[PDB]
Design a protein around this nucleic acid. Structure first.
Ligand code: MG
Ligand code: MG
Length: 64
RNA sequence: AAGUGUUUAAGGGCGCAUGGUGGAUGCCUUGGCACUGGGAGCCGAUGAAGGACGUAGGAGGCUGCGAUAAGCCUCGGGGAGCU
């Protein structure tokens, strides 16, 4: 999705906004998929990327 | 008139040529056995060994993986092929 350095240089408020929005997008796209009106898959994996990145960066900033 | 006599195979046996079933024989090795020289001699409450269940675009199974589910990041090695 974005560069890990992109959201490293991006702020905590923007990153929480992004985590909100991207959880929403995971939700929405994953279950449009589950509705089975689609053809591809990698969207779930990309949102996996973004969730893991946000979670890791939040731990990092919260720990030090 | 007389006495003399092969002349057939329902089947069978023997050989010969053909085949049929059964898979030994010969040839092969990703498999095993036994060693040598090295490495490592533990794994676990930061939740182990081993399992249930799930995980794919596709129904099951094996392999990996774990609702973040044939996987995710960051760093380094390779490439025009991969899912
Ligand atoms: Mg399995
Ligand atoms: Mg490298």
């Amino acid at each position: 999705g974005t560069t890990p350095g992109e959201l490293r240089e991006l702020t905590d408020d923007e990153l929480k906004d992004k985590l909100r929005e991207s959880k929403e997008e995971l939700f929405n796209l994953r279950f449009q998929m589950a509705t089975g009106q689609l053809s591809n898959n990698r969207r779930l994996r990309t949102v996996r990327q973004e969730i893991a990145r946000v979670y890791t960066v939040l731990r990092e900033r919260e720990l030090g």
